[PDB]
Scaffold this motif. Structure first.
Motif, mmCIF file in Angstrom:
data_model
loop_
_atom_site.group_PDB
_atom_site.id
_atom_site.type_symbol
_atom_site.label_atom_id
_atom_site.label_comp_id
_atom_site.label_asym_id
_atom_site.label_seq_id
_atom_site.Cartn_x
_atom_site.Cartn_y
_atom_site.Cartn_z
ATOM 1 N N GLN A 104 19.497 -73.323 16.473
ATOM 2 C CA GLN A 104 18.915 -74.492 15.805
ATOM 3 C C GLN A 104 19.245 -74.559 14.312
ATOM 4 N N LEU A 105 19.946 -73.541 13.808
ATOM 5 C CA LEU A 105 20.348 -73.473 12.393
ATOM 6 C C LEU A 105 21.312 -74.589 11.991
ATOM 7 N N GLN A 106 20.792 -75.587 11.282
ATOM 8 C CA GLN A 106 21.616 -76.675 10.762
ATOM 9 C C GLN A 106 22.330 -76.211 9.495
ATOM 10 N N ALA A 107 23.589 -75.813 9.664
ATOM 11 C CA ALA A 107 24.392 -75.237 8.591
ATOM 12 C C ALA A 107 24.518 -76.180 7.397
ATOM 13 N N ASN A 108 24.226 -75.654 6.209
ATOM 14 C CA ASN A 108 24.303 -76.424 4.967
ATOM 15 C C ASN A 108 25.670 -76.256 4.285
ATOM 16 N N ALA A 109 25.719 -76.424 2.963
ATOM 17 C CA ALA A 109 26.974 -76.307 2.201
ATOM 18 C C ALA A 109 27.396 -74.855 2.018
ATOM 19 N N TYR A 110 28.696 -74.606 2.135
ATOM 20 C CA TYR A 110 29.250 -73.245 2.150
ATOM 21 C C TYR A 110 28.641 -72.269 1.133
ATOM 22 N N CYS A 111 28.811 -72.568 -0.153
ATOM 23 C CA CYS A 111 28.397 -71.657 -1.224
ATOM 24 C C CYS A 111 26.872 -71.637 -1.385
ATOM 25 N N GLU A 112 26.217 -72.651 -0.823
ATOM 26 C CA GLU A 112 24.762 -72.758 -0.814
ATOM 27 C C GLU A 112 24.202 -71.996 0.394
ATOM 28 N N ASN A 113 25.030 -71.831 1.424
ATOM 29 C CA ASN A 113 24.622 -71.163 2.662
ATOM 30 C C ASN A 113 24.411 -69.657 2.525
ATOM 31 N N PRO A 114 23.186 -69.188 2.824
ATOM 32 C CA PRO A 114 22.864 -67.763 2.773
ATOM 33 C C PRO A 114 23.720 -66.947 3.731
ATOM 34 N N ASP A 115 24.092 -65.745 3.302
ATOM 35 C CA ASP A 115 24.723 -64.774 4.180
ATOM 36 C C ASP A 115 23.680 -64.215 5.139
ATOM 37 N N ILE A 116 24.141 -63.692 6.270
ATOM 38 C CA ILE A 116 23.253 -63.198 7.313
ATOM 39 C C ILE A 116 23.818 -61.902 7.870
ATOM 40 N N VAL A 117 22.935 -61.010 8.316
ATOM 41 C CA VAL A 117 23.343 -59.798 9.021
ATOM 42 C C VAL A 117 22.445 -59.594 10.241
ATOM 43 N N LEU A 118 23.065 -59.461 11.411
ATOM 44 C CA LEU A 118 22.344 -59.156 12.645
ATOM 45 C C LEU A 118 22.052 -57.669 12.704
ATOM 46 N N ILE A 119 20.770 -57.339 12.843
ATOM 47 C CA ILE A 119 20.315 -55.951 12.857
ATOM 48 C C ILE A 119 19.542 -55.675 14.142
ATOM 49 N N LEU A 166 24.967 -56.703 0.353
ATOM 50 C CA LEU A 166 25.443 -57.087 -0.979
ATOM 51 C C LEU A 166 26.876 -57.567 -0.902
ATOM 52 N N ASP A 167 27.722 -56.737 -0.293
ATOM 53 C CA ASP A 167 29.159 -56.974 -0.195
ATOM 54 C C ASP A 167 29.471 -58.434 0.130
ATOM 55 N N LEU A 168 28.883 -58.937 1.215
ATOM 56 C CA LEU A 168 29.043 -60.330 1.653
ATOM 57 C C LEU A 168 28.601 -61.345 0.591
ATOM 58 N N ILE A 169 27.485 -61.048 -0.072
ATOM 59 C CA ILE A 169 26.918 -61.890 -1.130
ATOM 60 C C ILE A 169 27.784 -61.885 -2.394
ATOM 61 N N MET A 170 28.168 -60.694 -2.854
ATOM 62 C CA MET A 170 29.047 -60.554 -4.012
ATOM 63 C C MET A 170 30.402 -61.187 -3.720
ATOM 64 N N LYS A 171 30.909 -60.966 -2.507
ATOM 65 C CA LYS A 171 32.152 -61.599 -2.054
ATOM 66 C C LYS A 171 32.008 -63.106 -1.796
ATOM 67 N N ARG A 172 30.779 -63.582 -1.592
ATOM 68 C CA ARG A 172 30.501 -65.021 -1.576
ATOM 69 C C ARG A 172 30.481 -65.572 -2.997
ATOM 70 N N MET A 173 29.888 -64.798 -3.901
ATOM 71 C CA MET A 173 29.767 -65.162 -5.308
ATOM 72 C C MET A 173 31.112 -65.084 -6.036
ATOM 73 N N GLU A 174 32.071 -64.364 -5.454
ATOM 74 C CA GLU A 174 33.435 -64.298 -5.985
ATOM 75 C C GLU A 174 34.127 -65.648 -5.895
ATOM 76 N N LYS A 175 33.963 -66.322 -4.755
ATOM 77 C CA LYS A 175 34.576 -67.633 -4.514
ATOM 78 C C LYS A 175 34.061 -68.695 -5.485
ATOM 79 N N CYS A 176 32.744 -68.726 -5.654
ATOM 80 C CA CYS A 176 32.105 -69.594 -6.632
ATOM 81 C C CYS A 176 31.588 -68.757 -7.814
ATOM 82 N N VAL A 177 32.528 -68.333 -8.665
ATOM 83 C CA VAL A 177 32.314 -67.350 -9.750
ATOM 84 C C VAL A 177 30.912 -67.333 -10.381
ATOM 85 N N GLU A 178 30.362 -68.525 -10.626
ATOM 86 C CA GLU A 178 29.051 -68.715 -11.268
ATOM 87 C C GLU A 178 27.977 -67.726 -10.811
#
Ligand SMILES: Nc1nc2c(ncn2[C@@H]2O[C@H](COP(=O)(O)OP(=O)(O)O)[C@@H](O)[C@H]2O)c(=O)[nH]1
Ligand SMILES: [Ca+2]
Length: 178
Positions: A104-119, A166-178
């Motif tokens: 049911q997850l309605q995917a939003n904008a790429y850089c706005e979209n939270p990273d996720i990890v299945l545990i 973190l890795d995924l988040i920092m690597k997400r933040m790399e694309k949108c440097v801000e």
């Protein structure tokens, strides 16, 4: 302080997220935001009417606190960057609810979209597996997120599951440097 990274621990109750966080964190700084929620009722006594005559007692119910719990949810989901998406290894309904909540997850904008990890938690109790890896690996392949067989008891995959967050988040933040 370097950066402020906000992570959420998600999953159905009893799955072990509070535990998961306790031993990992190692500190006693723990600010809580707690509201009250409730339901209540009122009674009325009316006669209901060729027309049989019945004494009727009406319990009319009401919910309270309702709105605060939305300002509460919003507060919880705001500016979120990482999703600790755990289920129970000893429970397939924990995987079922996950799959349907991911569905049911309605995917939003790429850089706005939270990273996720299945545990998958509780791996220190393998005698009770209702869960098959390859029948969970598909779901995390359907979405492109990593998976860890973790246990908040042994501490298995506890650090490297959050350090991988973190890795995924920092690597997400790399694309949108801000
Ligand atoms: N054996 C085992 N027990 C666990 C694990 N995680 C949680 N528990 C148990 O589950 C109970 C409730 O878990 P809890 O953290 O409150 O679930 P939550 O509400 O989703 O955060 C606790 O009493 C723990 O002993 C685990 O990985 N292994
Ligand atoms: Ca808990």
């Amino acid at each position: 302080y370097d950066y402020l990274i906000k992570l959420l621990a998600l999953g159905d109750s009893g799955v072990g997220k509070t535990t998961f966080l306790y031993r990992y964190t190692d500190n006693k700084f723990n600010p809580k935001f707690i509201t009250t929620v409730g339901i209540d009722f009122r009674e009325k006594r009316v006669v209901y009417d060729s027309g049989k005559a019945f004494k009727v007692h009406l319990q009319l119910w009401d919910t309270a606190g309702l709105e605060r719990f939305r300002s509460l949810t919003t507060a919880f989901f705001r500016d979120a960057m990482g999703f600790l998406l755990m289920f129970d290894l000893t429970s397939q309904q924990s995987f079922l609810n996950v799959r349907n909540w991911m569905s049911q997850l309605q995917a939003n904008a790429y850089c706005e979209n939270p990273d996720i990890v299945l545990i998958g938690n509780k791996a220190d109790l393998p005698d009770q597996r209702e869960v098959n890896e390859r029948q969970a690996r598909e779901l995390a392949e359907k979405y492109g997120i990593p998976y860890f067989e973790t246990s908040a008891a042994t501490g298995q995959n506890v650090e490297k599951s959050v350090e991988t967050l973190l890795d995924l988040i920092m690597k997400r933040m790399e694309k949108c440097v801000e």
